[PDB]
Amino acid sequence: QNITEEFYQSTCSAVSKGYLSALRTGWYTSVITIELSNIKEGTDAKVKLIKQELDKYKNAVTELQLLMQSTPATNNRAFLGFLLGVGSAIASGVAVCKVLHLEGEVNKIKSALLSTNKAVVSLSNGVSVLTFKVLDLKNYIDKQLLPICSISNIETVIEFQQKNNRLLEITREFSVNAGVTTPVSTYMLTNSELLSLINDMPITNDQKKLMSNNVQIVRQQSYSIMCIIKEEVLAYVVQLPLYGVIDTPCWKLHTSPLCTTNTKEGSNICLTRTDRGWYCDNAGSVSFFPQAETCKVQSNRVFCDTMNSLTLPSEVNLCNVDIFNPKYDCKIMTSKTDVSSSVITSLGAIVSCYGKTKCTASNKNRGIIKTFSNGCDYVSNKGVDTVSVGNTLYYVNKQEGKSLYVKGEPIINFYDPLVFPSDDFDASISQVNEKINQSLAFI
Amino acid sequence: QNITEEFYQSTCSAVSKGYLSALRTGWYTSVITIELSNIKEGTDAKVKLIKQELDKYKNAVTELQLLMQSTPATNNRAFLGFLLGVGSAIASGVAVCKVLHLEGEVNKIKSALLSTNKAVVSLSNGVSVLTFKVLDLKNYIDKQLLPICSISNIETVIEFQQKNNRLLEITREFSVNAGVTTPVSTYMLTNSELLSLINDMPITNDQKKLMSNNVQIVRQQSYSIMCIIKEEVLAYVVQLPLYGVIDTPCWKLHTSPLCTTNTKEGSNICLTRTDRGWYCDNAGSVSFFPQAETCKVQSNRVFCDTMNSLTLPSEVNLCNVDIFNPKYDCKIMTSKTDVSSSVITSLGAIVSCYGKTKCTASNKNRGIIKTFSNGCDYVSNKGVDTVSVGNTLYYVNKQEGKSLYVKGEPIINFYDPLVFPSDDFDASISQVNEKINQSLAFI
Amino acid sequence: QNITEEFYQSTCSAVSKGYLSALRTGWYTSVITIELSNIKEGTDAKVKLIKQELDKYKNAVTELQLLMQSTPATNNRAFLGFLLGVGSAIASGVAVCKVLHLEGEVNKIKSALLSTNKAVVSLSNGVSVLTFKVLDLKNYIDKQLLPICSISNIETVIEFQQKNNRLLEITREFSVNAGVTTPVSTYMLTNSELLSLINDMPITNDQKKLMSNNVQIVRQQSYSIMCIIKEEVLAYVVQLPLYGVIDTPCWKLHTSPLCTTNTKEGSNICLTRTDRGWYCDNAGSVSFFPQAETCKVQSNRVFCDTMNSLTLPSEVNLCNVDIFNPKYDCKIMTSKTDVSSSVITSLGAIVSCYGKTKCTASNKNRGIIKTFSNGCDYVSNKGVDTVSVGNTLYYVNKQEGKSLYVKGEPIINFYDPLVFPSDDFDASISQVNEKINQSLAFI
Ligand SMILES: *[C@@H]1O[C@H](CO)[C@@H](O)[C@H](O)[C@H]1NC(C)=O
Ligand SMILES: *[C@@H]1O[C@H](CO)[C@@H](O)[C@H](O)[C@H]1NC(C)=O
Ligand SMILES: *[C@@H]1O[C@H](CO)[C@@H](O)[C@H](O)[C@H]1NC(C)=O
């Protein structure tokens, strides 16, 4: 659609709006199965290759049984990303997998898939899961390999290597991942199977269209949890994202340090808005994502995970127009570190140029077209292809869109360096004012 | 076994105990070899496919020789994770690989594996390494391909593609990993080979049982170091973990911010125990792992790496019962950032609810069963399936175990906001008291 | 060459010099193509396997077309690594891929590769890109599969599975990577193709030699961007690194906390040089890399990316000899956290030993040879194989080189604990002096 951007000279920040939301709010767990064969069996070259591929099948099953001597688990914890909470990503999938170990539970799944490959099963604890038999190695081995150290053809040797290769690759992934994988590969769930799973999935037609048109993103936000091998059934849970928030406005906040440009070294004070990240309207509040690198962007669609978010009042948006607004305490950090750098935005580039640093913006066909002076400045991607700050070359995003340079005095000029609080990583406008008042009292 | 949990209302923290240790304390280096063939050789379709697979073999060897023009190296450095030291993970493996470049050293290995595939070799510097020949491409090429632009069969074309595929995949992994890979794949070392390596390994019967029952974890903590190609031998060092600490008590500390709940904005002070992470008794002290996500958990067994640990006095455990104890200076951080979030624990969930945030705990079959008020609170996973804080849904771990809610006044109530030190990421109880005393002196 | 190291007892730091630079300063974008076939077509076992592999070809094309419904994008942001700027890594490649969607542009590439596989094409916006047709599936399908539900041979079934496997694997990588991959695999660009691309690349003979001898590093610093499928052409952009800075001196700075060793707990003050990382002379300044783990090291050659760098005055090197020099304000952090740890350097080990921690250096053949006392100390890798601090065992790098122990009084002794500022993560020598002067004024 229409991506736009506004740069705020007063606070050394830029906001890119025009994006639409696609937020991971929940999980849907499906049970993928592979029906196994339980077999016990002079020789020629064609049969020797079959027995070789057959031992790869036996060892793969043995390896997966050895891998599941314990509850499946992943690694769990105990700018503002350090403010986020701590979830357990696969807790819902592990719970479903715990149910499959109850006796008779696997038999319910084995029975529902006897006449078809797609089925919805209600488990003993009342959870409605979608079940899927993607490979019937039982039917192949018992009907195309059991008739054989007897006669054989090589068209069978090849077809068995093709059909067994999926189980071998699924085992490889689970082996180097301790039974939990993300993203979900095409061996765990092919593109045809995933699209079929999304269509038979119980969701809105909006969610189906969104997931089908972005299967690569659905893969990156899914988990494959190796579950159980019991009664000739190989089952692993695939945990798929639910997008409960769709098509709400999103905007990306880019920030860079704002410093004074005095010549005498050590006299300079700096200030940086710390609330950078993705923002999306969500249920009367704003879902704020401090680590924007956790969100995936596809054109104007933004895919984030609410586990990596804070829920803030919508008044946080006021910090972009008036950082001194009386309704929200805008978060900033203070420092005396005036180092030069640049932040590439959606439609331009913020340049924090200080000291003796050479800062330019160039075009590919003409070279330098603008030389930045000391301070925090901005250039749009129209006519500009590269930005240089020191020895670092930045390419700018060449996506179409309009920028707006909002002129304003840098707020760092309003502060007396003698009473400026420094080394505050987690501060705000009011906290700095409160500390300056305490220092001015002692003077 | 028996996992239990205690929540401390006074300090907004929870401790999960009942776990057993499995700590990576050292390394064992083994030398895996692949015996190569040194060959120089109208045509039909079956031979054409053999010559195609033969050039894949030549290019794989050429590619691995080009990759080892230099010493193998990985990337090295120069809540409390920033306190950890800096190791060189593959320093022991690289040292062993440096020895294999000394002349006559590879010949010692080539000779020991002439009659068998398992052998222990004493190297020139006196290191006892386990040597393993996993693929003899020399024997296959010289006996099944050298007899051939002559007659041929397709059962050979297939068997050569199968046997050569391992060298092709080992080359692929080393190519996109600069010769150092982790975890160690099934191409580097199959499950049968790894288990065989662990059994012939010189360790306790306890370590063998532990490694064999958790090969997937052993893979994730191992490195494969591409070493040398000399005299028809392809050697790469596999660096396997040593678990010198086993079956000692472990417990996981979860912490969340504790803030005052005053209505006037900006008047609230916060406090967070920063010593969260995994703790395991280890040789009279406690091995503390500040980034719990570096540890892998299998049922009640906890796999950590001592490189990611601090060695602390056992009195650090006193911070869970009495954070004001006179024997250990409990680490905390101070802030005025009262944002809402939740921390999912082993057997429940800590909820830090502040401001206007909607915080609930729900059951799948009935919906909301508890609404949290402002402050830091806790709920156990019995009867609870989800926790919601703002727009973020958390699933709780559904593992069996008993929780205990230890009531106590939040220690944040004991502090005067007028003299409260703020923005201290690396503080402690005594440091805060020392700073408050200095502020009270000036008043 | 000659790697050397100096340890500074005064500031608990060590500098390793003797390295040569190889800095990623720019990007070169090439367009890799795969010519596709557009086909629409009782049966036997050999043909059935062909139709099975043919549907894998159709589904792979359909999957890649479904993947490119949107602009390709990656994840972007919005000790001193938090000072770095924010780039858009694939902005140059995405720009080139945007040009290929203009009409007639793909036809220009399709035409230039009709008679050869290597070609340089000038695009409509005037960018000179290197074009490469690596797979002609059109020529194979239209000439070896179109003659066929008729007669067939199995030597064709095998050759088709071999030739189609590359497209299947390229699709797999793009599927689990949202169309952007790094490092660039051997399926995206084989070793023969990459070396050929580097030779036909327009660069210095120095850059060609450097890239050819370190293709594994070039792979790790490259991106493969899935671009377009139009008019029987499968095109993806490969973004290759440009090394504009080569063979300048580099040195690695290792730092560890320096604390007082008083016996009464809580009275100790600590100080840590925060400017650790890689340093390379670059165009009159110094390119400083605060997160040394982002640089890859091959023997004495150091591969870094200027996007992960700050451009500093060369006087920053003065902090190693005289941390109180009047020309550069050396960056330090202050704390009261006196925890023990070690930092493994290039040629030795720094040991910060405090409290009751057992700190030793050992040899493999004799055990402990040195016991560290409280403070910050150092040992070289000559005669030393392991260092132990608490329950953590460190192996030291066994590379050849000379160390120099520069004796000096620890600067932490020069500070009065009563007026020592604490919890300053982003401080400097002058900022600490400025704060001590303010505290001494109030006293
Ligand atoms: C605190 O500081 C602000 C601005 O610096 C000022 O407007 C306000 O009056 C001060 N309050 C007190 C109590 O000093
Ligand atoms: C320091 O503060 C603590 C508690 O705030 C108090 O018990 C102690 O007496 C104080 N010491 C001094 C020297 O002020
Ligand atoms: C600041 O401190 C330094 C050293 O602590 C001293 O040399 C200098 O004179 C002080 N300056 C002032 C204005 O107090």
PDB file of C-alpha atoms in Angstrom, chain B residues 334-429:
ATOM      1  CA  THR B 334      16.434  -0.928  40.644  1.00  0.00           C
ATOM      2  CA  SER B 335      14.220   0.949  38.198  1.00  0.00           C
ATOM      3  CA  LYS B 336      11.071   3.042  37.893  1.00  0.00           C
ATOM      4  CA  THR B 337       9.803   1.066  34.877  1.00  0.00           C
ATOM      5  CA  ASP B 338       6.560  -0.540  36.063  1.00  0.00           C
ATOM      6  CA  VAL B 339       5.544  -2.472  32.954  1.00  0.00           C
ATOM      7  CA  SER B 340       3.371  -5.576  33.132  1.00  0.00           C
ATOM      8  CA  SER B 341       4.584  -9.036  32.126  1.00  0.00           C
ATOM      9  CA  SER B 342       4.603 -12.670  33.224  1.00  0.00           C
ATOM     10  CA  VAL B 343       7.287 -15.311  33.746  1.00  0.00           C
ATOM     11  CA  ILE B 344       6.258 -18.920  33.129  1.00  0.00           C
ATOM     12  CA  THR B 345       7.908 -21.148  35.729  1.00  0.00           C
ATOM     13  CA  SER B 346       8.316 -24.922  35.893  1.00  0.00           C
ATOM     14  CA  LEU B 347       5.064 -25.471  37.813  1.00  0.00           C
ATOM     15  CA  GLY B 348       3.239 -22.144  37.546  1.00  0.00           C
ATOM     16  CA  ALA B 349       3.458 -18.493  36.528  1.00  0.00           C
ATOM     17  CA  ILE B 350       4.661 -15.272  38.138  1.00  0.00           C
ATOM     18  CA  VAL B 351       2.558 -12.241  37.188  1.00  0.00           C
ATOM     19  CA  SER B 352       3.887  -8.690  37.502  1.00  0.00           C
ATOM     20  CA  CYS B 353       0.710  -6.674  36.884  1.00  0.00           C
ATOM     21  CA  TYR B 354       0.860  -2.874  36.994  1.00  0.00           C
ATOM     22  CA  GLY B 355      -1.092   0.128  35.783  1.00  0.00           C
ATOM     23  CA  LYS B 356      -4.186  -0.536  33.672  1.00  0.00           C
ATOM     24  CA  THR B 357      -3.148  -3.998  32.471  1.00  0.00           C
ATOM     25  CA  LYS B 358      -5.656  -6.852  32.335  1.00  0.00           C
ATOM     26  CA  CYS B 359      -3.997  -9.875  33.968  1.00  0.00           C
ATOM     27  CA  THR B 360      -5.859 -13.181  34.264  1.00  0.00           C
ATOM     28  CA  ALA B 361      -5.349 -16.919  34.599  1.00  0.00           C
ATOM     29  CA  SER B 362      -7.685 -19.175  32.634  1.00  0.00           C
ATOM     30  CA  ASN B 363      -8.672 -22.796  32.149  1.00  0.00           C
ATOM     31  CA  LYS B 364      -9.365 -24.244  28.711  1.00  0.00           C
ATOM     32  CA  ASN B 365     -12.800 -25.582  29.682  1.00  0.00           C
ATOM     33  CA  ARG B 366     -14.070 -22.620  31.733  1.00  0.00           C
ATOM     34  CA  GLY B 367     -12.175 -19.432  30.852  1.00  0.00           C
ATOM     35  CA  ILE B 368     -11.051 -16.925  33.462  1.00  0.00           C
ATOM     36  CA  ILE B 369     -10.787 -18.285  37.002  1.00  0.00           C
ATOM     37  CA  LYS B 370      -8.558 -15.622  38.619  1.00  0.00           C
ATOM     38  CA  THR B 371      -8.088 -11.899  37.988  1.00  0.00           C
ATOM     39  CA  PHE B 372      -4.800 -10.484  39.259  1.00  0.00           C
ATOM     40  CA  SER B 373      -4.710  -7.155  41.065  1.00  0.00           C
ATOM     41  CA  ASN B 374      -1.802  -4.725  40.797  1.00  0.00           C
ATOM     42  CA  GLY B 375       1.441  -6.116  42.215  1.00  0.00           C
ATOM     43  CA  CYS B 376       3.437  -9.311  41.826  1.00  0.00           C
ATOM     44  CA  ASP B 377       1.427 -12.512  42.238  1.00  0.00           C
ATOM     45  CA  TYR B 378       1.602 -16.193  41.324  1.00  0.00           C
ATOM     46  CA  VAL B 379      -0.568 -19.117  40.252  1.00  0.00           C
ATOM     47  CA  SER B 380       0.282 -22.814  40.010  1.00  0.00           C
ATOM     48  CA  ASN B 381      -0.312 -24.931  36.922  1.00  0.00           C
ATOM     49  CA  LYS B 382      -2.945 -27.074  38.680  1.00  0.00           C
ATOM     50  CA  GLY B 383      -6.269 -26.138  37.099  1.00  0.00           C
ATOM     51  CA  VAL B 384      -4.604 -23.345  35.086  1.00  0.00           C
ATOM     52  CA  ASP B 385      -3.769 -23.714  31.388  1.00  0.00           C
ATOM     53  CA  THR B 386      -3.177 -20.126  30.244  1.00  0.00           C
ATOM     54  CA  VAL B 387      -2.132 -16.797  31.721  1.00  0.00           C
ATOM     55  CA  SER B 388      -2.856 -13.480  30.000  1.00  0.00           C
ATOM     56  CA  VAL B 389      -1.034 -10.206  30.676  1.00  0.00           C
ATOM     57  CA  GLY B 390      -2.212  -7.448  28.367  1.00  0.00           C
ATOM     58  CA  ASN B 391      -2.382  -8.683  24.777  1.00  0.00           C
ATOM     59  CA  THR B 392       0.065 -11.550  25.449  1.00  0.00           C
ATOM     60  CA  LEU B 393      -1.201 -15.097  26.011  1.00  0.00           C
ATOM     61  CA  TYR B 394       1.086 -17.473  27.923  1.00  0.00           C
ATOM     62  CA  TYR B 395       0.592 -21.226  28.021  1.00  0.00           C
ATOM     63  CA  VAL B 396       1.821 -22.738  31.284  1.00  0.00           C
ATOM     64  CA  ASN B 397       3.859 -25.915  31.623  1.00  0.00           C
ATOM     65  CA  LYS B 398       1.518 -28.824  32.371  1.00  0.00           C
ATOM     66  CA  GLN B 399       4.105 -30.998  34.118  1.00  0.00           C
ATOM     67  CA  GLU B 400       3.163 -32.726  37.360  1.00  0.00           C
ATOM     68  CA  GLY B 401       4.423 -31.198  40.598  1.00  0.00           C
ATOM     69  CA  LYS B 402       3.440 -29.326  43.758  1.00  0.00           C
ATOM     70  CA  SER B 403       3.722 -25.566  44.266  1.00  0.00           C
ATOM     71  CA  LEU B 404       3.884 -23.650  47.542  1.00  0.00           C
ATOM     72  CA  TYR B 405       2.849 -19.999  47.885  1.00  0.00           C
ATOM     73  CA  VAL B 406       5.072 -18.448  50.571  1.00  0.00           C
ATOM     74  CA  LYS B 407       3.263 -15.322  51.749  1.00  0.00           C
ATOM     75  CA  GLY B 408       5.280 -12.242  52.657  1.00  0.00           C
ATOM     76  CA  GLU B 409       5.230  -8.459  52.391  1.00  0.00           C
ATOM     77  CA  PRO B 410       6.850  -7.175  49.168  1.00  0.00           C
ATOM     78  CA  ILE B 411      10.206  -5.703  50.132  1.00  0.00           C
ATOM     79  CA  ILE B 412       9.613  -2.729  47.814  1.00  0.00           C
ATOM     80  CA  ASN B 413       7.274  -1.338  50.492  1.00  0.00           C
ATOM     81  CA  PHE B 414      10.254  -0.885  52.845  1.00  0.00           C
ATOM     82  CA  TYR B 415      11.885   1.800  50.662  1.00  0.00           C
ATOM     83  CA  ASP B 416      11.330   5.560  50.669  1.00  0.00           C
ATOM     84  CA  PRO B 417      10.862   6.687  47.033  1.00  0.00           C
ATOM     85  CA  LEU B 418      12.464  10.068  47.783  1.00  0.00           C
ATOM     86  CA  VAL B 419      15.890   8.488  48.391  1.00  0.00           C
ATOM     87  CA  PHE B 420      15.487   5.358  46.254  1.00  0.00           C
ATOM     88  CA  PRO B 421      18.428   4.871  43.859  1.00  0.00           C
ATOM     89  CA  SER B 422      17.244   4.163  40.329  1.00  0.00           C
ATOM     90  CA  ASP B 423      18.745   2.742  37.135  1.00  0.00           C
ATOM     91  CA  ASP B 424      21.097   0.283  38.824  1.00  0.00           C
ATOM     92  CA  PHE B 425      21.384  -2.798  36.617  1.00  0.00           C
ATOM     93  CA  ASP B 426      24.199  -4.419  38.624  1.00  0.00           C
ATOM     94  CA  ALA B 427      23.315  -3.589  42.237  1.00  0.00           C
ATOM     95  CA  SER B 428      22.744  -5.480  45.478  1.00  0.00           C
ATOM     96  CA  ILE B 429      20.965  -5.124  48.813  1.00  0.00           C
TER      97      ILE B 429
END
